[PDB]
Write a protein that binds this DNA or RNA. Structure first.
Ligand SMILES: [K+]
Ligand SMILES: [K+]
Ligand SMILES: [K+]
Ligand SMILES: [K+]
Ligand SMILES: [K+]
Ligand SMILES: [K+]
Ligand SMILES: [K+]
Ligand SMILES: [K+]
Ligand SMILES: [K+]
Ligand SMILES: [Mg+2]
Ligand SMILES: [Mg+2]
Ligand SMILES: [Mg+2]
Ligand SMILES: [Mg+2]
Ligand SMILES: [Mg+2]
Ligand SMILES: [Mg+2]
Ligand SMILES: [Mg+2]
Ligand SMILES: [Mg+2]
Ligand SMILES: [Mg+2]
Ligand SMILES: [Mg+2]
Ligand SMILES: [Mg+2]
Ligand SMILES: [Mg+2]
Ligand SMILES: [Mg+2]
Ligand SMILES: [Mg+2]
Ligand SMILES: [Mg+2]
Ligand SMILES: [Mg+2]
Ligand SMILES: [Mg+2]
Ligand SMILES: [Mg+2]
Lengths: 46, 39, 141, 51, 94, 135, 51, 187
RNA sequence: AAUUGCCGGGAGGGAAGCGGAUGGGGGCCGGCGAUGCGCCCCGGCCGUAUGCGGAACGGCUGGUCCGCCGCUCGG
RNA sequence: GGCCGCGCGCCUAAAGGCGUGUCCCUCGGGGCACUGCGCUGCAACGGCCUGCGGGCUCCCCAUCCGACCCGUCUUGAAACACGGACCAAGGAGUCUGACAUGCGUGCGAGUCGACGGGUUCUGAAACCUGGGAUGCGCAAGGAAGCUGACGAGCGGGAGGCCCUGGGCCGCACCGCUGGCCGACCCUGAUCUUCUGUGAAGGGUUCGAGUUGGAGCACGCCUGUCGGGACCC
């Protein structure tokens, strides 16, 4: 799993010097606009 | 690039085999030109 | 959804797809199941044989739970045995009542391994199949 | 980076000006500016309704 | 989407993985793609695919122009090359 | 996510795609994105559905090509060059960074065509049009 | 009746439209029941809320 | 005027594309359109056609059928089904098989992998078997459906075992006057 | 909008309107229709090599750009 | 009437065209032939271009030819058959329930979280959770008492494989013959709590059965039916 860097807002504090988390498996899911269009229509009705 | 090199090898290889087909075809076409003449 | 209905494709066409001669009227033929023995007899006879008449005896206050007997076939018994129990096995003993079953039926093939089956009820072939595999049956309540 | 993971320090900010400062650091403020612009009246009858 | 680090780390506890008990959502597994590698170019231009394909064919045919097989000499030559020779024996009038 | 997958997702509707005259034979489509040499909604030219892309825009003419191993990092995805030399020297660099490199050789003719139009557009920008081109 | 269908049995011969019960108050019923459970919990502070 | 029917045009209809909008299926169709154009394989031509088929025309296949269709021929042979592989609890032995399918259930995928097999997509079978060499093409039961049981001759004609459309089952639901001789007739 | 007045235009032997085709008259239009492109005396910029700065492609060689030099001459 | 893709790398000739060698053919002069690589959108000339010029899908008129008033019921309407003086705005297959086929999506021997509960700082969204049995499925047959599938071949078959047309394996589907379950009928070694069991052996009988697990949920069109139910 490739590592994702974490952007730091404290560019001068820098408590650590390396921080990278494995890419979440949910980010390798199939991309299904056909089902997103279907499920978005029915959820907006609610 | 090996990707390029493979494509170049096969376009020449096919072209050579295309030359053989027409070179074989000239002999066939000439022979049939006079076979149908005789008939 | 109104945008896909065929009435939207019939705008400008006079009869809306119902004909100029045999128009769209209120109830030609009657309402509901009217005339099921007179002018709908062929339809009732062709597609619903058995519809009219009375067969059998009545049962006043027939409670469904009196006839509740869920059944399971032998071909599915070994799926209730976990992997580590089959590895250890002597025969695993399965109480099919803990899985929601009353009677054991005998469709399908059992593996050639012993198994003990606890049930309230069982058929004769299911018992014969279980014994042929080297197993046994215990009747419970 | 598009997955754009930001440190947990942003979980503690509590000011709108602080939030604007966080967005500028991560390069995500031009998206917020576009949304700040383009704010306008809805054309049609939904105007007269509560939208 | 801008993820804080805690949210991103939680993204595997929620939604889990392809393993069955691996998440909070009971009775859910990540969906599987119908195509393991959606790279169409890397499948069409693979060695196995390109080693079973016939030679490329880009010779566009067309309806041959009509050429009057009764009066156009070059046309009545390619059809029936004995034309001309039959005429000369015909013109050989005694 | 390969370019073929991205193309099918963005083909139908897009923030850069402009469609006109409906969905009859009258339909006219264009793309608004940079790194789209001909501004045409097609897989070959799309600046969204291709890993390797060339951009030929003015500023002096800026040529921009994208880095293949920096797709996940937009801030370092574009390698940009700014050229202020004569047209032929600029045309030679475009051929070098696009054709001779094998970085999209299929775009070398669209890129040189667009560089001609951009350079010509800048030519009249400094000195107004003194002749109209109707012949 | 014209084809191979089931024999229809629609119990809609009375004035069923004066007896339609919709459920648009379902999320409001959930909140009213939740509010009373919190009020009952405070009324008996140490006593268990489950009865 | 020329004497012809409908002007000689084809009046039969058939599918030339999938009716669905799945992008991964559209990518499979493009790949197999290419393969049948430039390999001229009978196997690839069937795959492209079935990739267009609807859900009821691609029945699910169970493990029991697969482990019996692929009985001894599971070495150097990939089973190919354009559909879904479902699991089967009624069998205990599962041989190692290479299977390609449109979808696997998570129980069928676990069953194949634990037995030593592989679950392949159709884009992986194209790399292994571009022309479908050493493959077994399989179909599920097309007519094993409850809807098909109501098809055919009408339930009220002789020699017919077509299911009627009844709201309930019991002694009072279509069992008299047409179903036995004691009430009228028995068709 | 129906319908009406005035001004200007046109037509009319017991209806008029309508389709096709031209003509006569009117009203419009100039992306309605061109004036550029290759060769030569005037205005005006630099290779080759270099030091330096950044950032590329392929999988360790080779690449482009910019600003500065110091030889160079074709544009 | 509609169309515009041979010629030169030898010479002479405005240009069409001529000019080499070889073998054969006779009766004077030809014929069939050498075949080697490339490039490969037909021309000439005129008038006119801001004008009283050109064009026109626009307006009016003339002429020639053609042309009966629409809608509707009907075998048949221009009808001496009905409705319609004109214009504007409004005006008629919808919503819900139950099924069904088809198609699309998810999961799949399972599926459904629909009523509730938890939570929710934008929310009558959303999100989580309750099923070891809630509903449909996974098993029939019989009025019922009650029993309940002991595991198939054959012919044709897409496709795959081997040899050089032949052979092997054969999915779906069609057709044929069986086995098993149940209703009815027949049958009966043996065990047994004496009325139960069932080794074997069946049947021109009957089933919405089995020997293929395919279903569940949602969405849409169409069709039938209850509702004002296309409108009056
Ligand atoms: K109709
Ligand atoms: K209510
Ligand atoms: K007048
Ligand atoms: K009428
Ligand atoms: K009338
Ligand atoms: K039906
Ligand atoms: K259940
Ligand atoms: K009976
Ligand atoms: K209705
Ligand atoms: Mg009518
Ligand atoms: Mg009628
Ligand atoms: Mg009639
Ligand atoms: Mg408006
Ligand atoms: Mg009533
Ligand atoms: Mg004709
Ligand atoms: Mg016709
Ligand atoms: Mg009879
Ligand atoms: Mg007016
Ligand atoms: Mg009449
Ligand atoms: Mg009429
Ligand atoms: Mg009359
Ligand atoms: Mg009348
Ligand atoms: Mg009247
Ligand atoms: Mg209106
Ligand atoms: Mg029997
Ligand atoms: Mg009995
Ligand atoms: Mg009414």
């Amino acid at each position: 799993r490739p590592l994702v860097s974490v952007k730091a807002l404290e560019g001068d504090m820098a408590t650590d010097n390396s921080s990278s988390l494995a890419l979440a498996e949910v980010f390798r899911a199939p991309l299904r606009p056909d089902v997103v269009r279907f499920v978005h229509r029915l959820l907006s009705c609610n | 690039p090996e990707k390029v090199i493979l494509k170049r090898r096969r376009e020449e290889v096919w072209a050579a085999e295309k030359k053989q087909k027409v070179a074989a075809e000239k002999i066939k076409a000439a022979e049939n030109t006079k076979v149908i003449y005789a008939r | 959804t109104t945008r896909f209905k065929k009435n939207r494709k019939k705008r400008g066409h006079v009869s809306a797809g119902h004909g100029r001669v045999g128009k769209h009227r209120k109830h030609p033929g009657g309402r509901g199941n009217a005339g099921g023995m007179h002018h709908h007899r062929i339809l009732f006879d062709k597609y619903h044989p058995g519809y009219f008449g009375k067969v059998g005896m009545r049962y006043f206050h027939k409670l469904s739970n009196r006839f509740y007997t869920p059944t399971v076939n032998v071909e599915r018994l070994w799926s209730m045995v976990p992997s580590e129990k089959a590895a250890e096995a002597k025969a695993p003993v399965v109480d099919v009542s803990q899985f929601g079953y009353f009677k054991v039926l005998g469709k399908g093939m059992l593996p050639e391994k012993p198994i003990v089956v606890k049930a309230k009820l069982i058929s004769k072939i299911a018992e014969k199949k279980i014994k042929a595999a080297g197993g046994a049956v215990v009747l419970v309540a | 980076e598009l997955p754009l993971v930001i440190s947990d320090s942003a979980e503690s900010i509590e000011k709108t000006s602080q939030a604007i400062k966080i967005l500028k650091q991560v390069g995500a403020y031009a998206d917020a500016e576009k949304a700040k612009d383009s704010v306008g009246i809805r054309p049609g009858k939904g105007k007269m309704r509560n939208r | 989407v801008i993820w804080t680090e805690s949210a991103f780390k939680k993204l595997e506890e929620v939604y889990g993985t392809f393993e069955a008990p691996s998440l909070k959502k009971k009775g859910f597994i990540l969906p599987r793609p119908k195509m393991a590698n959606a790279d169409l170019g890397r499948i069409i231009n693979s060695d196995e695919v390109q080693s079973v394909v016939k030679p490329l064919n880009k010779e566009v045919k067309r309806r041959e122009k009509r050429k009057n097989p009764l009066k156009n000499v070059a046309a009545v030559l390619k059809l029936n090359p004995y034309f001309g020779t039959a005429r000369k024996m015909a013109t050989l009038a005694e | 996510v390969p370019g073929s997958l991205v193309w099918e997702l963005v083909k139908k509707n897009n923030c850069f795609l402009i469609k006109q005259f409906g969905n009859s034979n009258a339909k006219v489509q264009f793309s608004k994105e940079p790194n789209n040499l001909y501004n045409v909604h097609s897989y070959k030219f799309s600046g969204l559905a291709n890993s390797k892309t060339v951009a030929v825009q003015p500023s002096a003419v800026v040529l921009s090509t994208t880095k293949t191993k920096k797709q996940n990092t937009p801030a370092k995805l574009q390698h940009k060059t700014l050229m202020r030399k004569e047209f032929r020297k600029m045309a030679k660099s475009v051929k070098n960074q696009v054709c001779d490199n094998y970085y999209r050789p299929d775009l070398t003719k669209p890129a040189l065509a667009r560089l001609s139009a951009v350079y010509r557009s800048l030519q009249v920008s400094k000195s107004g049009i003194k002749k109209k081109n109707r012949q | 009746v014209k084809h191979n269908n089931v024999i229809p049995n629609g119990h809609f011969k009375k004035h069923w439209q004066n007896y339609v019960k919709t459920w648009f108050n379902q999320p409001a019923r959930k909140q009213r029941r939740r509010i009373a459970r919190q009020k009952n919990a405070v009324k008996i502070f140490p006593r268990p809320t489950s009865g | 005027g020329i004497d012809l029917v409908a002007g000689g045009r084809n009046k039969r209809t058939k599918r030339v594309a999938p009716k669905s909008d799945d992008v991964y299926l559209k990518l499979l169709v493009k790949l197999y359109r290419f393969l049948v154009r430039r390999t001229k394989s009978k196997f690839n031509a069937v795959i492209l056609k079935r990739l267009f088929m609807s859900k009821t025309n691609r029945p699910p296949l169970s493990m029991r059928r697969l482990s019996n269709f692929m009985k001894g021929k599971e070495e150097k042979n990939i089973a190919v089904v354009v559909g879904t592989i479902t699991d089967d609890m009624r069998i205990q032995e599962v041989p190692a098989m290479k299977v390609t399918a449109l979808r696997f259930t998570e129980t069928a995928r676990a069953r194949i992998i634990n037995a030593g097999g592989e679950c392949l997509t159709f884009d992986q079978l194209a790399l292994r078997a571009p022309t479908g060499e050493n493959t077994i093409l399989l179909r599920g039961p097309k007519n094993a459906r409850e809807a098909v049981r109501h098809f055919g001759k009408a339930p009220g004609v002789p020699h017919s075992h077509t299911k009627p459309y009844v709201r309930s089952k019991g002694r009072k639901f279509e069992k008299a006057r047409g179903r036995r001789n004691s009430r009228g007739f028995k068709v």
